[PDB]
Every structure is written in C-alpha cells, then in structure tokens.
C-alpha cells in the first residue's frame, strides 16, 4: 500500500527520516519525478505556510533546496522537495561518503552560496546546523553539491534589520537567548565549518553541553594547529564567525571573500598582487609598517635559515622582502635552474605550498595587515567592499 495526494506519492515503509516536532521524511515521487515527501503535523501548519512560501521565493538558487509542490488531507500537510543522496551530518558521521571524493572547502563554499542568496532576499534561517544542509544525488557529469533546507523556522525582515527573542540546542547563536539579526546564522555556520573540517568536533563540545558552552562562551578550535597554513587559515575565519559579540561577526559575502576559500593560484596570485603593490613603499609608509607589525616571528627571524640548502645558495628578516624574494622566483621561473625548480616547483601549486608549509603565518598575517587596500581595484578579488 500507498500514500497518494496527488500529484504527491509515496510508500510509508521508504522513511529517509525524521524531524523532532513531529515531521516524517519520506523518498516518494511528484509528477513523475523522484521527490523526498515532508509530512508535517496538525500543530505545525504554520511552520509549513512560511517554509513553502519562503522556499518559491529561494529555490531557484542552486545551493536551496529544490520545493516542488504542498498538498492537504483531512490529518497532515505534505512538502514535496528536492531528493537528495544523504544530509551532512550523515556525510561526516560517516567515513564511506569519502570516496565520493568531495570537497569539504567546497560544501562550505556552496552552503555559505546558499546562505548569502537568502540573506540578500532579507531571510534569516535561523536553524542552520549539518542535520538541515543537504548533500544532493549526483548529476549526469557526477557532480555532487551542498544546499539549505529546512525553511520552517525562518524570519523575513524588511525597512529595520532586527529579529526578536527557536530553534534546536548546540547550534543556537548566544544572543538568540541572552538584538539578533543576519549574523545569528552566521555562528551557526562558523561551528558547521569546524564540525566539516575537525570531521565531528564542534567547537563548544559534546552534543549535550554545546548550548550551556555558547551562553559561557568557553569554546575549542584544538582540532586545529597553530604551525599548519591550512588550520592556520582556517582558524582565522571560524574565531571570527563564532564571536561572542555579533558586531563582530563578518557577513555572508565577507566570508566567501576569505582566504580559506582560495584555490593555490589565487593564494599565490595576492601574494603577487601585494609584492606588487608595495615599491615604489616607504617603510614610513601606512602600509609597509603595518605589514612589517608583527613577524620577524611569522618570518620565523631569518626566513633564509629555514628554506631549502639550494635555494639559499640562489633584509634576512622582512615579510616584505619575503613576498619580494617569492615574485622575483614566480617571475624569472622558467629563466631559473633546474636544481631550484626542482626544490620548489611545479608552479603555481606546488611553488605557493613550498613557502605556506615553511612560513604557516605568512598568508593569515598578510591578509589582515593588506586589509588597508581593501577599496582598491586591484584588491576586489580578495575583500569584500
Ligand atoms: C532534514 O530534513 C529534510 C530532508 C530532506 C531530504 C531530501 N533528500 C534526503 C535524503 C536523506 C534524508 N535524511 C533524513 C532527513 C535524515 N533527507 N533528505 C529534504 C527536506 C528536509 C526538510 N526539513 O525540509
């Protein structure tokens, strides 16, 4: 036997799963095509009236959730949606996923994509957590993708940007509880990217004590190491999007700007761009004595001392002059020899990686210190203004 509310269908036994006030997921079908069935209760018809308005408005976005139709009975409202292969906190929880060979900075990137479109359309999730965002089946090109889902708890504002003091404990932003705005979902992602990248961790614990830890503010980014360029990086943005103090927190679009996000070329073409930049500089300068304010220590002292015996041989204590030294070797590559193109080459992946591995500072520390050139058109590419 089977459920039809035309042209809604789907098979009781095919229970994808659940949803904790009262709501079923179910694998069914709508106008012929492979649909996942939401069967939500009596009590809850209010959540549904806002999710399947909210969801016509957003859908078109590739990383939203696809809505297709809602159809009534006489006992239950039923949400026909886009099918997916599983949800991200089965994709983490679940080490066999892996060979599907997908890309953790990726999924962020997509379900940052998704969260910036709602934004722009003045909606705030307010439920954002791994349960909620979706890995989708893969398409005829075997291409996988993040997207946002469960619409039931959002809020569109409109002239003012403020939300009143609600949703599932562990992932709640602390002034949710204690005026809340765009930035609640915000924190919410910041601990879905560390639970991603820590493969399970959050960064205010186990399930259990997470919420009590948000309202203390007593959290860990320990799955990340201070002297690795990846975790480096990747500390930078989570600290700073799970910020106790919202005014603090950076906007959807600030986020998809970060580093944290740059593919190899792109991390060595602002290490171009900056050298660049700087000369015709003078150390008196605004922005060289802003870029010199700190290493030496992210330089490690002397940045020669610790890099390879026949590169050495082809200030000692300057990130300047670093970054200087670095777009001397990308430009004259080729006009180089082999035994140092051997040493650090191929370019530009293998080249960027040879210095973020030796100096795990050096792209964090720039980043922040350039942040004065922000306005700039040649420094569009790597900021959000
Ligand atoms: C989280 O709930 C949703 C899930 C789906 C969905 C679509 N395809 C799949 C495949 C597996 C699956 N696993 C279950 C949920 C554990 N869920 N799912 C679609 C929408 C919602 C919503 N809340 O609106």
Same mark, same amino acid.
């Given at each position: ?10 098979? +009781? ?37 806002r ?52 890309? +953790? ?25 791994p ?15 993040a ?23 562990g ?8 005026? +809340?705005?765009?930035?609640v ?10 639970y ?23 959290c ?20 700073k999007?799970i910020?106790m ?18 593919? *190899? ?20 300068? +605004? ?47 080729r ?7 051997e040493?650090?080459?191929? *370019? ?13 500072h *050096? ?23």
């Amino acid at each position: 036997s089977v459920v039809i509310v035309g042209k809604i269908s789907f098979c +009781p036994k095919d229970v994808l799963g659940h949803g904790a006030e009262g709501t079923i997921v179910y694998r069914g079908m709508f106008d012929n095509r492979d649909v996942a069935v939401k069967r939500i209760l009596p009590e809850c018809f209010s959540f549904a009236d806002r999710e399947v308005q909210l969801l016509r408005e957003s859908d078109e976005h590739p990383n939203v959730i696809r809505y297709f139709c809602t159809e009534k009975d006489r006992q239950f409202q039923y949400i026909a949606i886009e099918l997916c292969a599983a949800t991200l906190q089965e994709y983490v929880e679940q080490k066999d996923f892996a060979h599907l060979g997908l890309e +953790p900075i990726t999924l962020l990137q997509q379900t940052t994509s998704g969260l910036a479109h709602l934004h722009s359309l003045n909606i705030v999730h307010r439920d954002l957590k791994p349960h909620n965002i979706l890995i989708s089946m893969p398409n005829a090109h075997g291409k996988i993708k993040a997207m946002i889902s469960d619409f039931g708890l959002c809020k569109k504002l409109a002239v003012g940007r403020h939300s009143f003091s609600p949703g599932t404990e562990g992932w709640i932003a602390p002034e949710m509880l204690s005026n +809340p705005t765009y930035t609640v979902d915000i924190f919410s992602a910041g601990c879905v990217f560390y639970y991603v990248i820590s493969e399970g961790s959050h960064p205010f614990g186990k399930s259990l004590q997470r919420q009590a830890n948000i309202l203390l503010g007593a959290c860990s980014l320990d799955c990340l190491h201070p002297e690795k360029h990846e975790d480096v990086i990747a500390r930078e943005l989570i600290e700073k999007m799970i910020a106790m103090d919202p005014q603090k927190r950076p906007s959807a679009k600030h986020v998809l700007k970060h580093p944290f996000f740059w593919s *190899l070329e792109k991390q060595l073409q602002f290490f171009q761009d900056v050298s660049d930049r700087i000369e015709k500089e003078s150390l008196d300068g +605004p922005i060289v004595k802003q870029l010199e304010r700190g290493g030496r220590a992210v330089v490690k002292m002397d940045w020669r001392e610790n890099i390879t015996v026949p590169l050495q041989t082809d200030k000692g204590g300057s990130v300047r002059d670093l970054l200087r030294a670095m777009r001397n070797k990308k430009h004259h590559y080729r006009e180089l020899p082999a035994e140092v193109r051997e040493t650090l080459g191929s *370019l530009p992946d293998d080249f960027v990686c040879y210095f973020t591995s030796r100096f795990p500072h *050096l792209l964090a520390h720039t980043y922040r210190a350039m942040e004065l050139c922000s306005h700039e058109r040649l420094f569009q590419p790597y900021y959000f203004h």
